[PDB]
UniProtKB/Swiss-Prot annotation, chains A, B:
UniProt keyword Oxidoreductase present: no
Major localisation: secreted
GO cellular component, one term: extracellular region
Annotated consequence of substituting residue 105 to A: No change in myotoxicity when injected into mice. Decrease in myoblast membrane permeabilizing activities. Important decrease in bactericidal activity
Disulfide bonds: 26-115, 28-44, 43-95, 49-121, 50-88, 57-81, 75-86
Effect of residue 52 to A: No change in myotoxicity when injected into mice. No change in myoblast membrane permeabilizing activities. No change in bactericidal activity. Decrease in calcium-independent damaging activity against EYPC:DPPG liposomes
Hydrophobic membrane-disruption site (MDiS), annotated site positions: 111, 114
Tissue: Expressed by the venom gland.
Impact after mutating residue 102 to A: No change in myoblast membrane permeabilizing activities. No change in calcium-independent damaging activity against EYPC:DPPG liposomes. No change in calcium-independent damaging activity against EYPC:DMPA liposomes
GO process terms (BP): arachidonate secretion; defense response to bacterium; lipid catabolic process; negative regulation of T cell proliferation; phospholipid metabolic process
Name of the featured protein: Basic phospholipase A2 homolog bothropstoxin-I
Reported effect, residue 15 to A: No change in myotoxicity when injected into mice. No change in myoblast membrane permeabilizing activities. No change in bactericidal activity. No change in calcium-independent damaging activity against EYPC:DPPG liposomes
Effect of residue 53 to A: Increase in myotoxicity when injected into mice. Increase in myoblast membrane permeabilizing activities. No change in bactericidal activity. No change in calcium-independent damaging activity against EYPC:DPPG liposomes
Length: 121, 121
């Protein structure tokens, strides 16, 4: 759920999840997908596609387990969906961190500035 | 949509919606989660709950008609969902204004990850 994801983003990026990625580009946020603005945006794009493939579990509300031992996200055993959900979030937190170098605050928004269509995931 | 909500909030509270509530506490803004920290956060909590009852429309993108008539938000879309959606927004806007007395800027960009679980709606 948003609790795991959010905590992961914070752990990987050190940034406030909602503040830097709640509304960022075309894919970081609660507004669906769009043509990636930049490497941070592309991370969220893939994240949303990662969710799409999921089957059965609610990526927004299903709470799952994961360890933060040695400051690396270790997805808990869980079940297939939950494990896959966790990996989706882990993956985006990491990607987000790895792309902090090009993170551009200018892509942060109040209301998504209209975005180009996003490749069918 | 966020446009109507943002204007309602500005109109009601007289403060920039995004800055003051875009990321306030545990329930305000980009999908805020968990138990409200205070009255203002509670408003957003109630708001997110109100949103759950919406059948047929999307608070994110669905625009709706409402008027500001004698400094009162007056919902206009006779379309049932949109009207209800509009009433959700109106209500949170009024609630925020009403609890401006305890608005805590230290929560303005609260670290949502710090948020505890929230009761069901």
């Amino acid at each position: 759920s948003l609790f795991e994801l959010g905590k992961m983003i914070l752990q990987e990026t050190g940034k406030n999840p909602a503040k830097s990625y709640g509304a960022y580009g075309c894919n970081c946020g609660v507004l669906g997908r769009g043509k990636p603005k930049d490497a941070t945006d592309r991370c969220c794009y893939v994240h949303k596609c990662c969710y799409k493939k999921l089957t059965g579990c609610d990526p927004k509300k299903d709470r799952y387990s994961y360890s933060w031992k040695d400051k690396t996200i270790v997805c808990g055993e869980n079940n297939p969906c939950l494990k896959e959900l966790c990996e989706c979030d882990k993956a985006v937190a990491i990607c987000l961190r790895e792309n902090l170098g090009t993170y551009n605050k200018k892509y942060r928004y109040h209301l998504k500035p209209f975005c180009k269509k996003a490749d069918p995931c």
